[PDB]
Ligand binder design. Structure first.
Ligand SMILES: O=C(O)CN(Cc1ccccc1)C(=O)c1nc(-c2ccccc2)[nH]c1C(=O)O
Length: 144
């Protein structure tokens, strides 16, 4: 299977699913360019490198509370109840929020390493699960 993918078994159902340990993506169905383009939604927490954003001068949520927020945004995006662009614009603690989280194109050697690795392991159109860096917790959408 492509880079990072392993076969696993569901806790509730017993059905096979697939888990990517590089993007933290998981999906039911069976699953490198010089440059990729991604958007993200960042949720900072009290242990972030810079616990401050356009949304909130002092970010005080714990890492666990950030992960809970991230997982709720993933659920809404996957259900189609909200789209990624809209939750990024509204809720991302990154300054790219004002561009629907779009970061433009980048190559390896530019981003923090867990962000880069996840970005380059996603398929075009594919969204990560929670990705952790010193900025905080991310949802990454690879758009090209
Ligand atoms: O201030 C910055 O520009 C970067 N920081 C603080 C920081 C500083 C050094 C290392 C890691 C994080 C952030 O926490 C941050 N990271 C991002 C980020 C992370 C991954 C991809 C794109 C943007 N955005 C932000 C932001 O405030 O707007």
């Amino acid at each position: 299977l492509p880079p990072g993918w392993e076969k696993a078994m569901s806790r509730s159902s017993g059905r096979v699913y697939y888990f990517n340990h590089i993007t933290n993506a998981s999906q039911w169905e069976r699953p490198e360019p010089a440059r990729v383009r991604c958007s993200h939604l960042l949720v900072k927490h009290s242990q972030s490198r810079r616990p401050s954003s356009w949304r909130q001068e002092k970010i005080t949520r714990t890492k666990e509370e950030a992960l809970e927020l991230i997982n709720g945004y993933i659920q809404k995006i996957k259900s189609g109840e909200e789209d990624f662009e809209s939750l990024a614009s509204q809720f991302s603690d990154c300054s790219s929020a004002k561009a629907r989280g779009d970061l433009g194109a980048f190559s390896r050697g530019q981003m923090q390493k867990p962000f880069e690795d996840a970005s380059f392991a996603l398929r075009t159109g594919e969204m990560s699960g929670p990705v952790f860096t010193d900025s905080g917790i991310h949802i990454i959408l690879r758009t090209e």
